[PDB]
Amino acid sequence: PQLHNGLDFSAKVIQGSLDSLPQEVRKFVEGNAQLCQPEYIHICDGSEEEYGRLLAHMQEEGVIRKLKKYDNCWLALTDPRDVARIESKTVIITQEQRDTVPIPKSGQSQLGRWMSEEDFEKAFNARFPGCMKGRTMYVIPFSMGPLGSPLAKIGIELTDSPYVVASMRIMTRMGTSVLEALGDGEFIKCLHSVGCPLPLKKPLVNNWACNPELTLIAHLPDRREIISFGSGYGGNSLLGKKCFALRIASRLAKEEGWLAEHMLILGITNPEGKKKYLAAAFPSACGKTNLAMMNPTLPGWKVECVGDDIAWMKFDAQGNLRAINPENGFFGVAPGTSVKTNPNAIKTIQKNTIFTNVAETSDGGVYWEGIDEPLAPGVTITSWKNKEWRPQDEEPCAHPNSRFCTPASQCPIIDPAWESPEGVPIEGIIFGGRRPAGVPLVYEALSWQHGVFVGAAMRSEATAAAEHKGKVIMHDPFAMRPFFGYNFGKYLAHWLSMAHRPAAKLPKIFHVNWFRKDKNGKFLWPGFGENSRVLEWMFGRIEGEDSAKLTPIGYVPKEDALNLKGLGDVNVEELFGISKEFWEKEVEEIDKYLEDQVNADLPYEIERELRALKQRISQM
Ligand SMILES: Nc1nc2c(ncn2[C@@H]2O[C@H](COP(=O)(O)OP(=O)(O)OP(=O)(O)O)[C@@H](O)[C@H]2O)c(=O)[nH]1
Ligand SMILES: O=C([O-])C(=O)[O-]
Ligand SMILES: [Mn+2]
Ligand SMILES: [Mn+2]
Ligand SMILES: [Mn+2]
C-alpha cells in the first residue's frame, strides 16, 4: 500500500474498476493520473449507452451539434489553428538519430523529425504535469485489426477529450471485449491531452479546447509509447491511426518482417467472374478514398472496399502477399464528395457519422464545396466558422481538410472479407500523386527493383492534409513522407528484400496520374468512376495480356488497349506524352534528393535503377 492516500485513484473512478484492469494497464492509468491530475477517471466499455452519454454530454457543453436532417449524425467545429496534421511538430525519439532518419549529406532531413530522449524529457515535463486538472481522463481500450485475431495490435489511449473517445469508437474496435482479449499481454501506450487544464486561463474558440503553441506529437518506438499534447484534430489525437498504425507499426513491421503502409485495399471483379485485390499508395488528399469506394462506369465491373487509408501486409506460407485493413471506419475528406464523384460515400455518411468543420444548413444538413447539390428555397448556410455564409463571399463554407468520420460496416460496397483475419491476397500495387505536368496517365514497372524505385521517386502537389501551402511539388516517397517510423534508407532495403523471399508471388507495380493538366489548366482525364478504365488495363496486365508497349519510363498501354469508348474527346497524345526535356529534369531532381536525403543509407539497387533510368532517357 501507501503511507497516505497517495496513489490509489479508485475514489475518482466514475465508470469501471481499476481492480478489473490488467496489472500493467492499471499502472499505466494510475501513473499518468498521478501526473496529469484528472478530476475523474472513466474506463470506456464501448457500449451504446456510453456513446449516448458522451454525445449528450458534448452537446450540453457546446462541443457538438445534432444534425437533425440525418440519423444520429453530429457536427463539431474546431479552433481554426487545430485543423490538420503538423508535420513540423511530429517527432520520433530514438537513442541514435540514424535509427529515425538517414543523416543527410548537406541539408536538413525531410524524412522525419528526430528528437533526443533528453530533449523530449524537458518538453514532456513542461506540458503534462497537471494538464488534466478539472477534466475526466477517459481510458480507451482499442484493437487495431479484427478483435481476437492473432495479427491485431492492442493499445490503451488516455485522453481528456470526449470528442476523441467518440471518434475512436468509430475508427477502431473499442471497449470491454478488447481488455478481455489483451489479458496480461503487450499493448501500445497512448497518452493524449488537449492541454487546457481548468480553470481556463485563455478563452476557447468555438468551444474547442486545444493548445497550439505547445502542440507536440511524439513517438517512442523503443518504449512502445505515443505521447500527444495540445491538438484535437483526428490525425494528432486518434493515436491508433497515423501514430500507431503507420509510424510505430512501420518499425515493428521492419523488426518482424511485414509492412505497414499508407494504402487503400480494394477488390475488383470483372465481367468473367474473376476477382483480384489491389493496394494503392497516394499521398494525403490525393484520391485513395475515392478510388477505394469507386462506382465504375464500365458495365460488368464491380469494386468493393476493404480499406481506404492503412494496410498491414505480410507474405504467407504459400508466397501470397496478404493485406488487412486495421481500421474500423473511414476518416475521409468531405469537400469534393458528391453523388457524381463518390456516391458510395454519400450513402455511407447519412447515419451514425461525426462531421468536423463542414457547413450546416438551416434544415439540419451538411454542406461543403463540390457537394454539387442545390438547396431548396429558404434554406440558409452556416459556415464552419459558425458564421452566416453566402455563396458569394471568398471564404469557403467548409474547411478544405474537413472530414467525416463514419463506420466502415455501413459502406454499401464493403468487401465481404474486410474483417477476415487471414487478409486478402494482393496482386498489384499502385503508386501516384498530383502531377500537373509530364507524368502520363499510367505506366507499369519493369521489375520489382524498378517498382521500388518508382515508389521512392514519387512527387506530388502539396495538399491541405498538413501545414504545407503553395501547391508546390514535393517529394513523398511511397506516400509515406509524414509517416516513416524509421530510417527511410532501411525502409527501401526492407522493400527490396521481399524479392529474396522463397516462393514470393510479387505483385505488379503501377504508377498513375489522374491530375495531368493541359495548356488551359483543366484536367485531361475525368477521373473518379472513369478510373475503372485504367483498372481494367491493370487487371489484364496481371493476367498476362499482351497489351503494353515498352518506353523509357516503363510499360504503357498499346494504342486501343484502353477502353476509351464514351469519352471520345480525350486527348490521348498529351495524356501519354513522354518528353525528354521533362524527364531529364525529373531524374536530376530525383538524383539530388536521394543523394542528399538518403546519402549513405541508399541501397545500391535503388542507385542502379536511377542510373538505368538516366541512361534510357539520354538515349531518347
Ligand atoms: N480530379 C480528380 N480529383 C480527385 C480524384 N479522386 C479524388 N479526387 C479529389 O481529391 C480529394 C482527396 O481525395 P481522397 O480520396 O479523400 O484523398 P485520400 O487519398 O483518401 O486522402 P487522405 O484521407 O488524407 O489519406 C477529394 O476532394 C477528391 O474529390 C480523381 O480521380 N480526379
Ligand atoms: O488523415 C489522413 O488520412 C492523411 O492525412 O493522410
Ligand atoms: Mn491518409
Ligand atoms: Mn482517405
Ligand atoms: Mn536484391
UniProtKB/Swiss-Prot annotation:
The active site is at C286. Substrate binds at R85, Y233, G234, G235, S284, N401, S402, R403. Changing H475R: Destabilization of the closed state of the omega-loop, resulting in decreased capture rates for the weaker binding substrates associated with catalysis in the phosphoenolpyruvate to oxaloacetate direction. It catalyses: oxaloacetate + GTP = phosphoenolpyruvate + GDP + CO2; L-seryl-[protein] + GTP = O-phospho-L-seryl-[protein] + GDP + H(+). Pathway: Carbohydrate biosynthesis; gluconeogenesis. The modification N6-acetyllysine is found at K68, K69, K89, K471, K519, K522, K592. Monomer. This is Phosphoenolpyruvate carboxykinase, cytosolic [GTP].
